[PDB]
């Protein structure tokens, strides 16, 4: 399985959706990201499953540092991706599956929530959950999601989704 | 040798309960009215107080219901409230999930005082709303064992713990 499929499958990455390879392959979609993550070249290669460099001698491995970079880069791409009609389509799918959890308010009656970020700057805050019914923001019940940066989901995702799919917005 | 009460409050899922003072239970005046709500009231009250005892499990079930009803009244008394306030300070009931409530500890609360109506819920004193416990281990604890007015009783007796919202 692809790096992306492998990543989105890990424990804690349930909120993520699989970004279409072609979206990533189009340089125009990643403009600006390459200057936010270290080892951008090797990291983007790892995400797309390509020959992982030469790698010769004592040359300290710095391997893990690249794995982390791929992780950050995938996140930033994810953020942009889920604003596009295709990404939104995929998230809407998970939404229908309750992939993001249900609102804990007793009166929201288990309204499924959408992931959301309190900030678009990486390292600011971890991902939170937005209930479209009571329109408030909650902390995920599972600690497994307490290390997922919210910037990988953005502050305007939930808004975008309902803008494109008004029919799913809770009534009254 | 652990007392029935100590044993009960120690079971998985009964973390929201506090241990009712034996003497409170021994005073007949405090239980007036309860004896006509649970079956086998005599044997059940005996089991709760650790006294000389197929219909067995049915009595264990009765002691469980009876302890709950007593708990409900108990936590309205200054002594019960004191104990609950303790657990409250330990975050024994959990913290509010609202991101902006900033992990405000919550108090248990019932949506109804009638047994069998609804399971126990959590009241955040900051956003003043009611939530369902994150852990499924608490999804079988009747809310009637905590009452609809407990949280409000606690803060009337301890206004100083009223969060600045
Ligand atoms: Zn809600
Ligand atoms: Zn709250």
Curated annotation (Swiss-Prot), chain B:
Predominant place of localization: nucleus
One Gene Ontology biological process: Wnt signaling pathway
Molecular function via GO: metal ion binding; protein kinase regulator activity
Entry keyword set: Metal-binding, Nucleus, Phosphoprotein, Wnt signaling pathway, Zinc
GO CC terms, sorted: cytoplasm; nucleus; protein kinase CK2 complex
Localization: Nucleus
Motif (KSSR motif): 134-137
Similarity remark: Belongs to the casein kinase 2 subunit beta family.
Domain remark text: The KSSR motif is part of a protein interaction pocket that mediates interaction with cellular and viral proteins.
Subunit structure: Casein kinase II/CK2 is a tetramer composed of an alpha subunit, an alpha' subunit and two beta subunits. The beta subunit dimerization is mediated by zinc ions.
Function as written in the Swiss-Prot or TrEMBL entry: Regulatory subunit of casein kinase II/CK2. As part of the kinase complex regulates the basal catalytic activity of the alpha subunit a constitutively active serine/threonine-protein kinase that phosphorylates a large number of substrates containing acidic residues C-terminal to the phosphorylated serine or threonine. Participates in Wnt signaling.
Protein name as catalogued: Casein kinase II subunit beta
Gene, per the UniProt record: csnk2b
Residues of the full protein shown: 6 to 178 of 215
């Amino acid at each position: 399985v692809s790096w992306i499929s492998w990543f989105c499958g890990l424990r804690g990455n349930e909120f993520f959706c699989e970004v279409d390879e072609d979206y990533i392959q189009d340089k125009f979609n990643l403009t600006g990201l390459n200057e936010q993550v270290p080892h951008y070249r090797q990291a983007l290669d790892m995400i797309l499953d390509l020959e992982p460099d030469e790698e010769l001698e004592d040359n300290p491995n710095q391997s893990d540092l690249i794995e982390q970079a791929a992780e950050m880069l995938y996140g930033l791409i994810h953020a942009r991706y889920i604003l596009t009609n295709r990404g939104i389509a995929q998230m809407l799918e998970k939404y229908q599956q309750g992939d993001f959890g249900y609102c804990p308010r007793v009166y929201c009656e288990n309204q499924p929530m959408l992931p959301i970020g309190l900030s678009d700057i990486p390292g600011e805050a971890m991902v939170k959950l937005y209930c479209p019914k009571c329109m408030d923001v909650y902390t995920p019940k599972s600690s497994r999601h307490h290390h997922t940066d919210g910037a990988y989901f953005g502050t305007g995702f939930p808004h975008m989704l309902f803008m494109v799919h008004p029919e799913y917005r809770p009534k009254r």
